[PDB]
């Protein structure tokens, strides 16, 4: 019941770690799934004709 005031390291680390985490999870979850579907789709689609 006193972390708000006495806790600059928490609030300063919250938004910091939070914001950085959002951009850190979006860069990985993206390049990952992307490079996954890009190689998986391009392949399965290439080998397996008829996709529509």
């Amino acid at each position: 019941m006193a972390v708000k005031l006495m806790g600059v390291d928490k609030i300063k680390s919250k938004i910091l770690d939070d914001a950085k985490a959002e951009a850190n999870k979006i860069i990985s979850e993206a390049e990952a799934e992307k490079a996954k579907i890009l190689e998986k789709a391009k392949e399965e689609a290439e080998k397996r004709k008829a996709e529509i």
Side-chain angles (χ1 to χ4, degrees), residues 2-47:
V3 184
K4 235 67 85 142
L5 277 126
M6 302 214 186
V8 62
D9 273 62
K10 273 289 177 167
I11 56 90
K12 171 265 265 293
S13 174
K14 211 307 298 246
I15 311 116
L16 273 179
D17 295 6
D18 168 63
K20 266 109 270 255
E22 223 174 343
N24 280 334
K25 231 66 133 261
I26 201 66
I27 54 115
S28 297
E29 290 255 74
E31 75 188 14
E33 276 183 84
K34 169 186 111 182
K36 263 209 69 225
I37 54 137
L38 266 295
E39 79 91 80
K40 282 293 183 205
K42 186 91 83 68
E43 277 285 352
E44 66 203 29
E46 269 260 63
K47 56 98 88 127

Side-chain angles (χ1 to χ4, degrees), residues 44-52:
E44 66 203 29
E46 269 260 63
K47 56 98 88 127
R48 215 263 253 169
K49 275 260 251 75
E51 59 181 14
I52 307 299

